[PDB]
Amino acid sequence: VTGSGKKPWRQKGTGRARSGSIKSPIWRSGGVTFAARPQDHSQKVNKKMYRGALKSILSELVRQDRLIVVEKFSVEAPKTKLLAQKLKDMALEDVLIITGELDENLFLAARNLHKVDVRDATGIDPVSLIAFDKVVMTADAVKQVEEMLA
Amino acid sequence: AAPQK
Amino acid sequence: ARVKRGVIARARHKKILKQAKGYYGARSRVYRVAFQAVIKAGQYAYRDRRQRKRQFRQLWIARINAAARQNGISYSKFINGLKKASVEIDRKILADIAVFDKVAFTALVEKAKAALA
RNA sequence: AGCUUGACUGCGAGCGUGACGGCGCGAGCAGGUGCGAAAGCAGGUCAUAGUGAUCCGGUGGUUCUGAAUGGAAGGGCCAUC
RNA sequence: AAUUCCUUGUCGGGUAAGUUCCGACCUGCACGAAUGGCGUAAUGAUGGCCAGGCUGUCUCCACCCGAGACUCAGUGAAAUUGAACUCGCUGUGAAGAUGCAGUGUACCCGCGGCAAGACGGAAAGACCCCGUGAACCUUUACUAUAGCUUGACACUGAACA
RNA sequence: GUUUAUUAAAAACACAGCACUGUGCAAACACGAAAGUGGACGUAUACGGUGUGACGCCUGCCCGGUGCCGGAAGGUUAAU
RNA sequence: UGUAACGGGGCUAAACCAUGCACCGAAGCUGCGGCAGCGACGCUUAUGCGUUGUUGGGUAGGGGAGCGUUCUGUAAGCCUGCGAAGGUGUGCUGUGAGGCAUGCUGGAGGUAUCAGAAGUGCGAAUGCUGACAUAAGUAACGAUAAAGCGGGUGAAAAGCCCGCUCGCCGGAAGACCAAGGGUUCCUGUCCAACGUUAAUCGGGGCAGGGUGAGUCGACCCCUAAGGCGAGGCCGAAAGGCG
RNA sequence: AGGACCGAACCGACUAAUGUUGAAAAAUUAGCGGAUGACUUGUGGCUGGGGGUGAAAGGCCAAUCAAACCGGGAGAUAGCU
RNA sequence: GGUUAAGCGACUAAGCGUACACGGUGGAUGCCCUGGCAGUCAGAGGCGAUGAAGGACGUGCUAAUCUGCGAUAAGCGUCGGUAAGGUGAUAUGAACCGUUAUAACCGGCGAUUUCCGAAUGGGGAAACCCAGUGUGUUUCGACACACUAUCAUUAACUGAAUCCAUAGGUUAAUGAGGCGAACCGGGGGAACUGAAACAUCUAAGUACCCCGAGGAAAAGAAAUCAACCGAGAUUCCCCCAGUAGCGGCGAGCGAACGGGGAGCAGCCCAGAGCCUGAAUCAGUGUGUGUGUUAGUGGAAGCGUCUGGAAAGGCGCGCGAUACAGGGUGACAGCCCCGUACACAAAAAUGCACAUGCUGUGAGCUCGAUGAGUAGGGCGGGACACGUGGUAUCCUGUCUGAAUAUGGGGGGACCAUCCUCCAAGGCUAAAUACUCCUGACUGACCGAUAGUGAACCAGUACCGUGAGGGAAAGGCGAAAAGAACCCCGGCGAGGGGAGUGAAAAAGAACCUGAAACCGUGUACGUACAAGCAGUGGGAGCACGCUUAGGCGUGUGACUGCGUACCUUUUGUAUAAUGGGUCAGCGACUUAUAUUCUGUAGCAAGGUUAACCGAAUAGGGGAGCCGAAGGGAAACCGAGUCUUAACU
């Protein structure tokens, strides 16, 4: 806190509580007693614990019938309207699309549909699998995940 | 100042 | 995140000052004084639930003694007689009958005398 | 009063007393001794006071260590100041 | 005695009465010769003692004159403050009670006065003790050191006894 | 004469005078890492330090302790 | 200080001794209802329930379980101008921290559940800041040089303006300047704030005006103490001296 | 003539009273001391913090002094409340 | 019925108490953000004698302040962008400019740029005083303009003591000077504190002072390590390792070798010949690509209900590489500004190059190979290393080699072996920082917080000065900011009227708590003694009703009862602390280590830095564990002790 170290008043004789700095945290405009600092909140997770957790989540998505598997998922042009119709025909919403290779047309089309995300099979994560109501995987994506999780 | 005991 | 205390502090203080209604002076107006008053009143309340039981039994006995002596026997002899007669009417009831049913009390007194005779 | 060096070296079942550091008692094993004919006794003195941790440094020994290698210095271990 | 503890030493003067004052004695606890001894005219808002004059200093206070205090109108503080429905006495009790026990007294509320109490207000006792607190000062405490002082080498050479 | 501005004005400080002692001038001594400056544009009848404190009569004995001054034989003793 | 050596009244027993039977007397014990801990054994659990025994004062302190606040995810969800948060009453509810509903005010936000992180809970620190009390409508209104009356102006006059008396200073309490200040000067207008009261007045607010030099002063020429100082001398640097 | 005498200005501060939330963080009133000198006063200058200055009281150095003030080391340390 | 006596007794409230209703004061709480904080990715890393940073005074239709600008003064010229509206703000008004391109606005490049300030012609109390020389004008009175500081280097001309000379002097050219947040190298260099005191030691080569530089700086191409095998300049990160050592052997301090990474770069002089001007790099002219300094286009919605207002509810549509964000009368993909995306530079400029010109000189051969130096004695300092048995580096003082047939090092020292060439110099990247510019982000703050400063804040104010240093946000959607009437002093203040959804939103303005102060109503209270309550309880007032008994308020009388905190053996204590209310205010964070719970894997477990189109995957360098005993060599389910073990 900005301010000099000058003692506000003599130690004795004034009839007033003893003070040593205007910057004391007891005072108005004083410092914060345990002032925060920038800090890193990340945690370690063991590789086997991370991969072990993914296997559990994937097994529930099957057991809950939330995992859908398809042969192909692609769109002829980046037009968002095309993807919206395709998902409506499948009665899909709040869906995570996982593909074994990224069709740039599919990526662009999904970008404005906030209820939709498009992910390459390398980019899956614990939270997205749990947050979305349905997960759609191409048969290629499944095999890449099997090889990834082994 | 004053006279002290 | 920073947490401001004002809303919770007011609610807690306001709870205490509601219990202090009726107290004289600062006891019903100022939190520091009202808090001490509310706690002390709680102590008396705990204590006096026991005294209440003592004070009433003391009152019943006095009334039984008065009515018993009107019929010519002291309380200590009257109670002793009822024990010999195997009468379990407790003192709360005797003090009631003593006031509201003087003829019924006289029968009890005569029942006690017959056990002492 | 005669003869001697057990006022020995390595250990030690098991106990006593201390918060601890420590202090104390001890049969019996191995080696090698003294006295006694022998059984045996001797690990100082009828017992309980006569004393001072660690660090640092000195002296002697030693089948340990030795900054490339062979030594050496320095260090360790043992006795003692 | 600016020094003398015992001590108001003892004797004399001054007073009706003198632990102070003046003179003397010498038993100088514990004077003393330049950290000076003993005198000394003048001087001192200097210490002590006595006398004349003067006087409300006093016996012993009285009256009077102004400014406040008092009442009315206007303006308008402060120290202090756990809360109060804030008596006496005797006892008890963290041992000195408005508040507890027993008992006595006491209609409710102001104004002018006095200060016995609220261990009244003001200041985290300045005395005392403590802190392996602080400061500054002293010295033949300890360890250093500026300065002063000794010697060797350098700048720095020649000849001879 | 001076002094504790703001509780002490005095018997305290200063004083003229006295004594000791240091200083031969690039003085002693003081302020300065030094240069330099004061002393002093002075020169022992001058300058510094110390104690005493007009004036009058005076200022007695002790050099064992501490200090200072002089000495150098011998003992001991640093760097080298 | 005042009975003051039964707590008091009072007592010839209402004292003392001995014996005896009643009764009063506590949060002790019993009765009735509720809660919780620790064991044991089971309707059977699957981790909770049942029967039973026993336990449940507590500082320093150890162990267990929870409430509530702000923020992040669930949440582009749910509630809300047919009224959110916040404020203020009321009723119900839990063993407690608390929770829920709703009248009035308010006028645009709030947030379930389950997880996550803390500037997460205040009566004290002669704590810090702001506001408001007390003493109290009390003390005081700042030199004991002194006022009185008439007229004017004005909403209002002890205090302003004019007049006549009275008093005070006069080696100043008069007059002119330097230093310092900086518009306080003069005029008109206003009286909220300032003026220790009132105010029509003011050194107060607002607007305008006012300071004229060859000769007065500064500037200027010349120097003192002293300052700075080319080169210079000296000093780790910065610098010192001259 | 005079660190001569009496006494105003001027400089000081011996006594008493008042005041002590003062008119005033050192004054007022009535008396008091020096007043041609080691006097007093205006303007300017110089000396700086273990330093200055001191007719010496540890006195003064901007209402502060047995070591000024400001900023920093610095949240010194506090077996204490 | 009358009189007298005896007994009992309501109606008083000066004021006060409790409750409730309604106000005032005050500014908490909630909501808000044009202000802060910490970062990420880029840029820039300086400005100045061509006069800086920072100021003074001016400048408008202009009284003040702010912002801009400088006597050409909220501006001038030119080139571009853009344009239907403008003449900066508080802040209106007046007088005007402009509308298809010379209004304004934005960007590049120019011009003007008072006075002070390094301040530079001399002086000085900053924003002031006084000149000299030379050009040019003149109205004869005077004007305008330029130059004139110091130091260093170089050149010319002069020139002593002193013959030559030199010192010195004059003149010209070039350069410096001052400011600025952190980072960097060097010269100096504390103490508090810890050690439970303290002196070696620590704090610490820290704080601080001084000098110098850059966009980075420094270091750097082995007289280095290693260990008989080899590596190969410097710098930075993770290990090794809290190990080996140092140490009043105390408190503490603390490596290297070796391994994994980021990055990667090597050269020149000590010198001649040959061949010449080939490498490479510095300046600078030209050209291309690309970034910057203004910009351009940029999709898709209306019905009805509530409402002051529609972005909300309900119904039916459409866009999307755009559902980032902000505004509009309540919450908007389709109303507006933007966004995704595609485009644009007359001029200046940062980079990448290509290339012209100037400078440089590449390659080969032979030769050379840094002396008051290495080393030593004495005193210090740096190395983790405190003089220790102390290797190695620096040097204040005194000395002093050999020089490839030679020297340095391998931790006292000697021998052998290995390895490398000091006494000359240059060199990018990986690394450190942010006064400053742009974009974006936050389990960061939200007016007592966040910067001291959300507001005309480093201001007001305080101090001689250095320096210290505040308080202060919110009407409404829109000023529609209350015409007019009445009381009043041609006041303050108020009551109507009117605006608005609201005026109890009226500028003293969002919400508006508490303390504190009032007005009204119900009950109590003037014979009564104390922590002010608690248990019982009459009466009264008001509501509800099952009609004699419930709720709320009050509380005559009566039993019991000496605040809270702290500190203590012990407090009603007459021990401490608090006038009250509201806001703030104290067990935190980082990194090691150990134990417990819980999860994964299990004789195995786990990665760090770093890489990574990045919470994945890679990286096993390392670390703990499965073997101990001993001082150690060493042995090993055993080992040490001892000649040996019962």
Ligand SMILES: COC(=O)c1c(OC)cc2cc3c(c(O)c2c1C)C(=O)[C@]1(OC)C(=O)C=C(OC)[C@@H](O)[C@]1(O)C3=O
């Ligand atoms: C037994 O004696 C006392 O009872 C007593 C006294 O009884 C009348 C008066 C005083 C007066 C004072 C002092 C006292 O101590 C004192 C004492 C003890 C001070 O210490 C003083 O207190 C501000 C100060 O700080 C420095 C001073 O001198 C260095 C004094 O002058 C001081 O100024 C003061 O006035």
Ligand SMILES: [K+]
């Ligand atoms: K014998």
Ligand SMILES: [K+]
């Ligand atoms: K004597």
Ligand SMILES: [K+]
């Ligand atoms: K005198």
Ligand SMILES: [K+]
């Ligand atoms: K009194």
Ligand SMILES: [K+]
């Ligand atoms: K005097």
Ligand SMILES: [K+]
């Ligand atoms: K004196």
Ligand SMILES: [K+]
């Ligand atoms: K004398």
Ligand SMILES: [K+]
């Ligand atoms: K002597």
Ligand SMILES: [K+]
């Ligand atoms: K002598």
Ligand SMILES: [K+]
């Ligand atoms: K002698």
Ligand SMILES: [K+]
């Ligand atoms: K509400």
Ligand SMILES: [K+]
């Ligand atoms: K408080």
Ligand SMILES: [K+]
């Ligand atoms: K009052």
Ligand SMILES: [K+]
């Ligand atoms: K008035």
Ligand SMILES: [K+]
């Ligand atoms: K003078």
